[PDB]
Amino acid sequence: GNDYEDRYYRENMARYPNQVYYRPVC
After folding, report:
1. CA angle at 17 for the pair 16 and 18, rounded to the nearest 5°
2. Domain range spanning residue 26?
3. Residue 22 in contact with residue 14, Cβ under 8 Å?
4. Residue 13, SS3?
5. Are 16 and 25 in contact (CB under 8 A)?
6. Residue 3 and residue 25: Cα distance in Å, rounded?
7. Taking a C-beta distance cutoff of 8 angstroms, is the pair 22, 15 a contact?
8. What is the rounded CA–CA span in Å between residue 26 and residue 9?
9. Within 10 A of 6 (CB to CB), how many other CB atoms are there?
10. Which long-range contacts (CB under 8 A, 24 or more apart) does 15-22 make?
């Protein structure tokens, strides 16, 4: 959070465990 965001830091940076990329899952 002290970096930049915290509530928005997790957005596209901490996604689903099956997401090899951002959108790419398959």
Report:
1. 90
2. 1-26
3. no
4. coil
5. yes
6. 28
7. yes
8. 25
9. 9
10. none
What is the total count of domains within the chain?
A: 1
Do residues 26 and 18 touch, judged by C-beta distance below 8 A? no
Integer-rounded Cα radius of gyration of the chain: 11
Distance CA 11, CA 4 (A): 13
Rounded to the nearest 5 degrees, what angle is found at the Cα of 21, between the Cα atoms of 17 and 26?
A: 80
On whether the CB atoms of residues 17 and 24 are closer than 8 A, the answer is no
If you count DSSP H runs as helices and E runs as strands, how many of each does the chain have, helices first?
Answer: 0, 0
- Give the method of determination: NMR
